[PDB]
Every structure is written in structure tokens, then in C-alpha cells.
Amino acid sequence: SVVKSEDYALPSYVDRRDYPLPDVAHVKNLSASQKALKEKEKASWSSLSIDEKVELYRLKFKESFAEMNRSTNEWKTVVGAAMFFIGFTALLLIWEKHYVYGPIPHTFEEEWVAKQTKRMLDMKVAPIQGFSAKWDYDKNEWKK
Amino acid sequence: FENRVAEKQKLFQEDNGLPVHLKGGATDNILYRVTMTLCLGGTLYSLYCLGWASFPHK
Amino acid sequence: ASAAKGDHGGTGARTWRFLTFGLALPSVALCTLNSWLHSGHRERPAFIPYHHLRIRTKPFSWGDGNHTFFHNPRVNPLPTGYEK
Amino acid sequence: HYEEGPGKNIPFSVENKWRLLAMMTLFFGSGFAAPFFIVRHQLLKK
Amino acid sequence: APDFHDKYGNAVLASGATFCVAVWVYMATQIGIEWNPSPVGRVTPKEWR
Amino acid sequence: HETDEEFDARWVTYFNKPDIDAWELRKGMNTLVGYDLVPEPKIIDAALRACRRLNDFASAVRILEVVKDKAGPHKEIYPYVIQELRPTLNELGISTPEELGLDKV
Amino acid sequence: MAYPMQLGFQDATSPIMEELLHFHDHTLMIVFLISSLVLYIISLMLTTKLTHTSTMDAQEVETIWTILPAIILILIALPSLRILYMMDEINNPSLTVKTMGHQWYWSYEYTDYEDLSFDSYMIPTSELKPGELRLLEVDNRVVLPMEMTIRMLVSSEDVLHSWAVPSLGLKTDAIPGRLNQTTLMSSRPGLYYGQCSEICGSNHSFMPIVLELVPLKYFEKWSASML
Amino acid sequence: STALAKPQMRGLLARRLRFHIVGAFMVSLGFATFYKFAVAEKRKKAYADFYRNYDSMKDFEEMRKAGIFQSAK
Amino acid sequence: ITAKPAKTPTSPKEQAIGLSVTFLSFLLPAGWVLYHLDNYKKS
Amino acid sequence: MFINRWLFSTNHKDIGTLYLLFGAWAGMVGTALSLLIRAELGQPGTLLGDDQIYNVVVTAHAFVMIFFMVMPIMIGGFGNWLVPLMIGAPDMAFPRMNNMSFWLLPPSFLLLLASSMVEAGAGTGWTVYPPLAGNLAHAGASVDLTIFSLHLAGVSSILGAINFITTIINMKPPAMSQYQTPLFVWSVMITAVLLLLSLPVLAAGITMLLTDRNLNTTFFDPAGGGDPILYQHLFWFFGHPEVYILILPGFGMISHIVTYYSGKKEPFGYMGMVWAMMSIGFLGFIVWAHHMFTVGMDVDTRAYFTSATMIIAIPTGVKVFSWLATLHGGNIKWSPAMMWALGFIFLFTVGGLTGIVLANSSLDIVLHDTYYVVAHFHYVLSMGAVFAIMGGFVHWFPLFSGYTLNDTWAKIHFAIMFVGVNMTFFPQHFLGLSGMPRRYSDYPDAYTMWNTISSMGSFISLTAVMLMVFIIWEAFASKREVLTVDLTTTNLEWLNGCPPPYHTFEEPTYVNLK
């Protein structure tokens, strides 16, 4: 029933698939009816009804193996919330770009970059693989 | 000299609840207050000096 | 130094076996690798009949008198130079 | 002797969660803010 | 009995993924960020000398 | 290193001890399920009969549960085990977890 | 120089830089393999309901995971040290050039015959000619003969700097009171760029290196032109 | 139909591990082969091809004509 | 781990408050300094 | 009573709590500095100023993260809280000296603050190399305050090391040998031996820098016959051990976490784990010059240091495979601490492997002083040391506080942080291979895309840090008091409840010999 803080020095109940028979019964204090059932249990189990058998099981254990092993929907909450917060971060980045950053240098302007690109090809920057390798110097175009 | 350790043992085991750094009596409190006042005052002073040194001066 | 290791509590057989297999023999293994890896003959240098080397003031009491005890023909010249 | 148990073994109080939020906000906020204001100080200094 | 994740997990996942993609796409494409992609297959080289 | 046969026999003897107590039943099962095996029917048989001597029906059901659980994805093991145990289940009146509906969330 | 969205090394301009590229490919294969094996094994450990929680004996398996990494390390160290000793080889240069680091620019001295020296400063962004590269150009490039073994001597007249040219595989610290030597051999003409590679104060980011590799006859014309 | 036969009941975890560590080896092998052709040999071929008939004077003259050099107009 | 129910449960509304207050306490001071950077690099 | 308890402490748990508070606050400072770095680099051009203000930020970022966040949290915080409990001891050997190791850190931090406020700050790198750090290129008080900051941090840790070694050798139950103590205890003891031996050398080195700057010595000044490279040897003789100091307590916490959430009573291959930590600690003293492969050393020296550095992969690999073998066969509990530890195993492995790349002196010529190095050490520090810290904090927070966290929130926090650190640092490999130098406030235009992405990653990690503060608040706000935990038979620190009483083990454990 009710676990108390002053009880950490005592054996406790656990539902763990690799500790199938815990140190204590799930239900410690039995009612008059429950004690009766435990007396019946000393006779043949064939004389136990299904409902009574389940009640004996639920005296001893909290969750069954199928119950303790159940999957949950938690991953949906975790993945969606994480995406929410990652989305929130982009708001910060938008704010930074709007109020903090000034213009970037003029070397990123389209005409500068076109000229820069030609000069890099003229000096054959990375001509084996990296860059000029990808320019067709005969056809004067990017290698298709 | 004579061995007066037993009398110091009696003094420092007296059940008066005092922590060891004060158990010698009123002299301990004086020395403690001198020490702590110098430490805390000197620390305040060091902070003042930071503030002074943090801006262009002289 | 404290070296960089750590144990004691008790220096005992178990600790010294730990040191033997965990530090001492691995170090021997490493040095064995390093050595048998830098082997491979060096070029023997030009023979020069320096007077402070290949000393003979009395014949050696074995062989022909003129060969050192662990004479290696490949790398130990005689006073007149490398043999054969 | 000292007080023992959850929320008693700490140099700050958790008796009121909103007082606590203020404390924690001052505590972590002041550490996060200090580098921005030092940078401002150095940029303003000269 | 259904927990928070049974009740709301589907909505959290859908709304979170939607917000995230939309705001990042916007940040990436609509506010003047210079990504400086490769000029290969993009830039026409222009005379500089 | 014992043969499987000697391992199994040790565990059958363990659970067959007539005056085995509750602590020993639990110790035995909780130890056994740490190994990389699903216990042989002859072991489970001895364990269920110890449950009988200890007037503990619920642990009998729990033992059937952990046998199924130890098989992991190997779905053929539990029906074979239940097959081999059905004489004992009948003799002792042990309902399976499934019969008790304890296999459903 | 580097180009936008580059993932790997600048194209090799020297034989030693090509050796490093092949050695890096070899080592990165191993890094990717071990990384991916660890990732896979993590997923393998985490994806079964089967259990085994009693004590496991470790001796046999630890032979394998000490001997196999030992062999892999040897397979990295063998080509690694081959290249190390290759870089160190007697190369007999035909030219020596000195460079001196300063806050914040490089000077160069060609004192084999003529006593030539000059300073090399970054071109400010506001003075770049159209199509020139931000933070990388200099006013006076290190003119050098291609396809020739060159001895570069590096030092500093103030704080530490470091003289680097990635596409030649070069990085030599510039330390006052010390004369460090490296060897430079460009397989190709062209312009090769590098940047100061030891923190040196206010303008550490802004003191680049530019080599200008040209045929010997053109190098000689250039030196002759400095009389 | 009749009696179920005894499935393997011992060492299921070890059997799973062995099968997949061997499988991981096979993939590693395979990947080593892919990488040596898609990356390492590709790079070796690219440099060897570039230089096999490379004309460093012709390359220089092209750069010179394009005006890239300070020292050689 | 097992635990008693919350002595002073924190509702989703309460969490939204604590979260917002926490995030603001990091963002607003830094924001103020960074917003005013240009205003600093001239004084 | 408040002052007696919190300023005059002689209690290992309260002193551990002070260290955790201190290190958390330091972690905010260090995070702010990292965001200033990444704001400067987040687009081309100049945001703040030239390399001076920028590298004052970089320098402070490193000192704060290493000396005021990681070491106080791992060694002062988890070490003080956990080590006496894990050996059943009633406190540390020198409970009063322990309190001085703590109270030296706020003064140390104040000196670091003062260094950045006076003059133009110490824009030297955390390595503080002369002559840049000398009295002509860094005239004025900033570098001297930085040296004094390190002196006080050094004394704090040396005394703490003396305390931990003495406690761990002398205060175990009389039946417990060293080979019956938990791996986290081993990891602290070995870390403490490394601190004891390495910090005095650093102290010697920075004292010589102090006297070069103020008493006209010339240890590092060629004009007097000194040598800047001597400083580098002295610094790195400490600085390589220091990175093993930063990771070893992390290894010890990872061992406990992986064991616990695999449902195991013990880590796989205990004696191999002890061997591996001792081996790493020993090898960590004979490799320092791999920080110096471009300074001009002779080729045989570079070959020795290449080889000796790579062999550390062997014991480290034993630990990685033993963690995997601890997971093997487990009943895995997918707790947030387990997520931190799994992320640790993989990402620490990636960073260790790029360290092995860097160990090759030939390739290090091209990689040295580039962002490849930055990528290497942030995988082992931002995704190794920090993940071990986060895993241990979420695992043991209920022990220290008596309250549970919200596990779903902690899992969200892990997910955000995982994305953020990988987005920040993985592209820095490309920046390094392609030649972007360290300690630059601005970069050639070709480097823009990956710098942009890396700075976006740093903001995601900032969102995680903020969320962590809220999560800790939520736990203290809701007050879910712990009842029981699993596996106390193999996790003694839990067996006095949550939180444990001020005094524990007043009656020591009973352990017999047989």
C-alpha cells in the first residue's frame, strides 16, 4: 500500500523482469477476506476459481510481466518537445541576425564573387579534385 | 618546566559546547575577530582596488 | 615521484602479479617489438687501420692468436682489414 | 545540530517555489550575464 | 489509464515538427543569411583583370 | 564447467529439497534467470512443486511468466515448455498466465 | 587555397602533401570503421529482450580487444613514420629563403647572393582589387622557383608566429632566438596561400602568407630585377 | 502437428552476439573494399592522371597570360 | 526509482511560468548588451 | 548556524554541494563565453573587435570550463559526495582542509574576472605562451592576475588530491582491499595522483613566467639565454595529464551509470578497468610533446611522441569495449542518465579517434593550430566530460537532493543537447582539414558555411542549458520525495536514503574476511 521515507533500510518491492520474485509481497496487510483466500490457497489450487487465482497473484505482485513490459507514447512527447525547442532556437538566430549582425563584407556580392571565381580558375585553385578540376577549360563551362 | 598537559586536557575537554578554535577562552575570540576582520576588510579593499584598476587612471 | 599508477592499501602478491602482467611484461613486449624492427644490418664502415684499435700486444690464447673471442667476420676487421 | 532531509541540506530555501525561481534566476542569470557585461566594459573602456 | 503521452503526444510531435521545420526554413532562406555555397555549377566567372 | 546435464540436475535437486523455504525459492529463481538460458522443463517442474509445498500459487504463475520472458523473441520456447509441463500444471492446478489473463495489458 | 563548402584537405601542391593525403585516407578509413563498429555494437547491445546478468568472464575477450587495436595502431604508425622520416631526409636545396614573423606581417630575406629583403602585409578589405581574396592577399608575395627544392628558415622578431602553407603541407613555428628549417618543393606554378598559425596578438587573423611559384628563368629575372 | 520439438534453449544471447559480430566483420570487410576504390584509389588515380602528361611550363604560361602573377606580367 | 507524489505539484501553467522566467533571465541581459554593441564600439 | 554550516563546513556532503553549486555557476559563465566566440564567428567580418578582445574571451572560456566547471563538479562535487559513501567512511581524511580546497576557488575565479576587467585582458590562449604573455606584448596586470588565478586553483586541487588519496587508501573498511572498491573511487584516486604530480610542474612554469614578467628573470627570454619552448614543455608536462584528469572521473561515473541502468550488479571486467585507468594515467605523463610537433624538435623525438601517444588507445579501448560488454545481456532501463552515458561512449570514441589522427606528427603538421584540434577536444570535452557530468547529475540528483527529476523533461534536454553539440563541432573537422586556424576572430570567405552552421549549433546548446535550469527548478518546485531505488546491494551510496543524513557511517559497515 503506502511506502514511507523512514523505510529505506527495509526490503522493498520491485517489478523487474530479472528479479521475478521480489523480497516482499506487494500487499503486506491482508483483510479478513484476503486472509481467508490465503487459507484456501493451502488446499488444492484446482479448487481455486480463476478470479481467486488472479487475486492471489495480485496480493503477491503489483504488475504482471506483460504490464511491466509495456511500451509507451513518451517518445512522441520527447521528440516533439525537442523539435519545439530547436525551433525556438531559430527564433533566437533570427533575432541575432536582425539586431546584432551588420552587413557582411563586400566580397560576397554577386559581382565580386563572379570575378573572384574567375581569378581562382585562372590560378587553377585545387586543379586535381577540389575546384578547378570541376571546370571544363576547353568548353569554358562547369563540367556537366 | 613541569608537565602541565593534564591541565590543558581538562580545559579542552570541558563540556561547554565551544568549538575547538574558541575553547581556550576569551583570547581565542579576540584573535578570531582580528583575523576575520582583517580578512573581510582586506577582501572588501581588494574589491575596491579591482574597481579602481578596471578603468583607465593615474 | 608517485609514478602515475595508484594502488597499495596492501602491497601483496596480487598487486605484484598485477604489476608483472600489466606493466612489466607489456613493456618488455613493446621493447621487443621496437628492437626486432630496428635490426637489419648496418653498413660496415670503410676499414681504417687506426693504431688505437685492433690492439695486439700478445696473441690471444685461442684460434690463430689474432681473432677476438666473439669475432664476427662481417663486422670485426683484423689488424690488416676485413677477412675473406 | 543542523536540519536534515529533502530541501534542508542546501544553502538556499525551497519552501516557496516562486522565491526559489527568483533565487535560481539571479544565480544562473548572473553567471550567464557576466561575460556580456565584461565585454561591454572592455569595448567601452577604450 | 491514459497518461500525458497518450493524450497529447501525437499533437506535441506533429506541432513540434511543424514549428521546427517552418522556423528553420524561414531563418535559412528569408533573412539574408549568407551561406556562401560553392560556385561550382552556380556562378558564371566574370573578367577581373 | 559442468555438462548441461549436471547443471540441470543441480537445479532440480535444489528445488526438490522438501523443506525448501520461501527465501530459497526466491533466491533460486532470481539467480537462475540471470543465466543465458531458459530453464529446462525439469527444472521448472521442480520449482513449481516447491511453490506447491510453500502454498504459494502466485509465485508459480510468476515462474511461468519469467520462463516466457527469458525466451525473448524465440516464440517457440514457451509453448514447448508449457507442453512439457502440462501434466504438472494439471496435477497441481496451476493456471497459466494466459489462462489468468495476466498476459494482456 | 580553401574553397566554399570544402570537406577535406586543400589539393596537394607538393609530393609530401600528396603522401599526407593518402595517409589521411588510410587513417580516416580506420576511424570511420571503428566509430561505426562502436555505434553498431551499441545498437546491438540495446535491441534484445534476451538477458544475461550473472558474472561474465573477461579474460578471453580482452586478448582480442588489446591485440586487434595493437595491430591497427601498428598499421597506422608504419606509414606515419615512413612519411615523417621522408620529410626529414637530406634534400640538398638550391635556394635558401628566410622569413621573420612580426606583429603583424611577415618579412622575407633572400641572402644567398644579393641581399634582398622585404615586408609582406595583408591587403585590407577596402583596398582589394576586384576578384581578390578577403584576408588572404599580400602586397609582396614570396616569389619562388617551382620544381626546385627550397630551404625555408623561419624565425620571429617579437612573439611567436607560425608559418604555414597547407597545400604544400607546411607549418613551421616562428620563434624568436631560434632558426627553424623546413623544405618547400612545389610541383606546380601558381599562387599558394597560408595564414599565421600561432596566436600572436591583435592581428593574428590578419597576417597571411602568399607564395608565387614561377619557372626558374622567371625567378632569376625577378631576382635580377631587384638590383 | 503432434508434439512440439525442443527448441534451442541455452546460450540464446551468445548465439545472437556471435552471429552479429561475424556479420559486422563482413560489413567492415565490404566497407574497406568500397572505401579503397571510392576514396583512396580514386584519389591515387586522380593525382597520377593529372600529372601523367602535365606540362608545368604550359600551366605557367596560362596563368601568366591571365595576369595572375606579380613577378611575371 | 520510486517516490511519493509531489508535495507541491507544479501544474503545466506553473511550468510555463518557470520556463519563461528562466529563459528570459538568460536572454534579456545578453540581448541588451548585444543589441547595443554598435552603441559601445563608438563610445 | 547558516554560517557555521556553509562557510565553516567540515562535512563532505555539504562541501560537495558547494562545489556543485560553484561549478554550475561557472558553467553558465563558460557557456556565455562560448556563445560570444560563436557569435563572433557566426558570420564573416568583425562583430566585437580585433583578436585581442576575441582571444580574451577564448582564453577565459577555456579556463572557466576546465578549472571552474569540470574539475570542481567532477572531483570537488561528485568526488566529495560519493567517495566517502562508496567506501562507508564517515567523512574525508582532512575534513577541514577539504573546506579550504573549496573556498580557494571563488578567489581564483575573482582573479580571473579581474584579469579580464583590467587593461585589455589576457588574450593569450589558456596555454599562456610567452613571449605573447610576457611583459612587453602583454604589459600590465592581466596576465599576472591569470597566473595568480591558476596558482590558487592549483593549490586547491593539490590539497584536494592529498585529501582524496589519503581518504581512499586509509579509510576503507579493514576487510575491503583496493580491489574491492568501486570504479568511481579508483577513478578519483588515479585522477588525484595525476593532479599531485602535474600541478606542481605547472606551478613552477607559471612562476617562472611571473618572474620573467616582474623580477627581470629570463627563463623564456632568448636575450638572457632563455627559451620560449622551455615554457611549452613545462606547461604541457602538466597539460596532457590535465586532460586525463578531466576525463578519468568521467570514466568512473560512466562505469557506474552503465552498470546501474543495464541492471547489472557489476561492470564487465573490473580488474581490466582498473588496469586501463592506471595505464592511461601513467602513459598520460610521457606524451606531452605531441602539443609541440611544429616547434622544431628532432625527428626521432617526434617519432617517439607519435608512438607513445597512440598506445593510449589500447587501454582506452579496453574501457570502451568493457562498457559495451556491461550493456550486453542487460535489462536496459532507458533512463535519461543512460542516454547521457550511451552518447558518451560513442562521441568520446569519435573524439579519441581524431586524437589518434593528431598523434601522427607528420599529419599534425597540417592539422596543428587548426580547427581539427578544436573538433577533437570538444568531442572529448563537450561530448565526453560534459555528458558524463550530465549523466551523473541526473542519476545522483535524487540522492543528493531527496527529490526526483521529471524524466521526460530530462530526456528532452538530452535530445536538444545532443543535436546542439554535434551541429556545433562536427563541421569543425572540415574547417580544420581545409586549414582554418585556431584563435581567429575572422576567416577567409571560403570558410563561411561551416562557421555559420557551427554557430547555429552553439545556440541549440544554449537552449539546452537554459532548459536544464528549468528542469532543476521544476524538481525542487514539485518536491517528489524519493522512496526507494533498485540495486542498493551494489550501490552503497544510496543505502542511507535520500538525502543521507548529515553524519553517515557513524557506525561503520560490517565486512568480514573469511
Ligand SMILES: CCCCCCCCCCCCCCCCCC(=O)OCC(COC(=O)CCCCCCCCCCCCCCCCC)OC(=O)CCCCCCCCCCCCCCCCC
Ligand atoms: C545528430 C545530428 C546533429 C546535426 C549535426 C551533424 C552531426 C553529424 C552526422 C554526420 C554523420 C556522417 C558520417 C560520416 C561523415 C563523413 C562526411 C565526409 O564526406 O567526409 C569527408 C572527409 C574528407 O573527404 C575528402 O577529402 C573529399 C570528400 C568528397 C568526396 C567526393 C564527393 C564529392 C561530393 C561530396 C558529397 C558529400 C559526401 C558525404 C557522404 C556522407 C556519407 C555518410 O572529411 C572528414 O574526414 C571529416 C570527419 C573527421 C572525423 C570524423 C569521423 C567519425 C565519424 C563516424 C561517425 C559519425 C559521427 C558524427 C556525430 C553524429 C552522428 C550520429
Ligand code: HEA
Ligand atoms: C578530456 C580531454 C581530452 C582527452 C581524453 C584527450 C585524449 C586524446 N588526445 Fe587530446 N586534446 C585535448 C583534450 C583531450 N584529449 C585538448 C584540450 C587538446 C588541446 C590543447 C590546446 O592546444 O589547447 C588536445 C590536443 C591533442 C593533441 C595535440 C594536437 C595539436 O595541437 O596539434 C593530440 C596529439 O596527439 C591529442 C591526442 C589525443 C589522444 C591520442 C587521446 C587519446 O587519449 C584518445 C584515446 C581514445 C580512443 C582511441 C578511442 C577509444 C578506443 C577504441 C574504441 C579502441 C580502438 C582504437 C584504435 C585502435 C585507434 N590531443
Ligand code: HEA
Ligand atoms: C571542458 C572544456 C570545454 C567545454 C565544455 C567547451 C564547450 C564549448 N566550446 Fe570550447 N574550448 C575549450 C574548452 C571547452 N569548451 C578549450 C580548452 C578551448 C581552447 C582555448 C584556447 O584556444 O586557448 C576551447 C576553444 C573553443 C573554440 C575555439 C576558439 C578559437 O580557436 O578561436 C570554440 C569555437 O567554437 C569553442 C566553442 C565551444 C562551445 C560552442 C561550447 C559549448 O559546447 C558549451 C555548451 C554548454 C555546456 C557544455 C554546458 C556547460 C555547463 C555545465 C556542464 C554545468 C551544468 C550544471 C549542473 C550539472 C548543475 N571552444
Ligand SMILES: CCCCC/C=C\C/C=C\C/C=C\C/C=C\CCCC(=O)O[C@H](COC(=O)CCCCCCCCCCCCCCCCC)COP(=O)(O)OCCN
Ligand atoms: C652475457 C653474455 C656474456 C656473458 C659473460 C661472458 C663471459 C664472461 C666471462 C668472464 C667475464 C670476466 C671478465 C673476463 C674479461 C673479459 C671477458 C669480457 C666479456 C667478453 O666476453 O668479452 C669478449 C672477449 O672475451 C675475451 O677476450 C676472453 C674471454 C674469456 C677469458 C677470461 C679470462 C679470465 C678472466 C680472469 C678473472 C679474474 C677474476 C678475479 C676476481 C677476483 C674477485 C675478488 C668480447 O668479445 P670480442 O670478440 O672481443 O668482441 C665482440 C666482437 N663481435
Ligand SMILES: CCCCCC/C=C\CCCCCCCCCC(=O)O[C@H](COC(=O)CCCCCCCCCCCCCCC)COP(=O)(O)OC[C@@H](O)CO
Ligand atoms: C603566489 C602565492 C600563492 C599563494 C597561495 C597560498 C594558498 C594557501 C593559503 C594557505 C593557508 C594554509 C593554512 C594552514 C593549512 C594547514 C592544513 C593542514 O595541516 O591539514 C592537515 C592535513 O594536511 C596534511 O596533513 C598534509 C600536510 C599539510 C599541508 C599544508 C599545505 C599548505 C599549502 C601550501 C601550498 C602547497 C603547494 C605545494 C606544491 C607546490 C590536517 O587536516 P585538517 O583537515 O585540518 O584536520 C584533520 C584533523 O584530524 C587534525 O587534527
Ligand SMILES: CCCCCCCCCCO[C@@H]1O[C@H](CO)[C@@H](O[C@H]2O[C@H](CO)[C@@H](O)[C@H](O)[C@H]2O)[C@H](O)[C@H]1O
Ligand atoms: C548569445 C546569447 C544571446 C541570444 C539572443 C537573445 C535573444 C533575444 C532576447 C531579447 O533581448 C531584448 O531584445 C530587445 C530587442 O528585441 C532589446 O530592446 C531594445 O530594442 C527595442 C526596439 O528596437 C527597444 O524598445 C528597447 O528599448 C531596446 O533596448 C532589449 O534590450 C533586449 O533585452
Ligand SMILES: C[C@H](CCC(=O)O)[C@H]1CC[C@H]2[C@@H]3[C@H](O)C[C@@H]4C[C@H](O)CC[C@]4(C)[C@H]3C[C@H](O)[C@]12C
Ligand atoms: C593480472 C591482472 C590482475 C588479475 C587479478 O588479480 O584479478 C590483470 C588485470 C587486467 C589484465 C590485463 C588486461 O586484461 C589487458 C591485457 C589483456 C591481454 O589478454 C593480456 C595482457 C593484459 C595487459 C592483461 C594482463 C593481466 O591479466 C591483467 C593486468
Ligand SMILES: C[C@H](CCC(=O)O)[C@H]1CC[C@H]2[C@@H]3[C@H](O)C[C@@H]4C[C@H](O)CC[C@]4(C)[C@H]3C[C@H](O)[C@]12C
Ligand atoms: C623533450 C625532452 C626535452 C625537454 C627540453 O627541451 O627541456 C627530451 C629530454 C630527454 C629526451 C628523450 C631521451 O633523449 C631518450 C629518447 C631519445 C630518442 O631519440 C627520442 C625519444 C627519447 C625518449 C627522447 C624524447 C625527448 O627528446 C626527451 C624526453
Ligand code: CUA
Ligand atoms: Cu602572427 Cu598569429
Ligand SMILES: [O-][O-]
Ligand atoms: O591533450 O590531449
Ligand SMILES: [Cu+2]
Ligand atoms: Cu596531450
Ligand SMILES: [Mg+2]
Ligand atoms: Mg601552435
Ligand code: NA
Ligand atoms: Na568574426
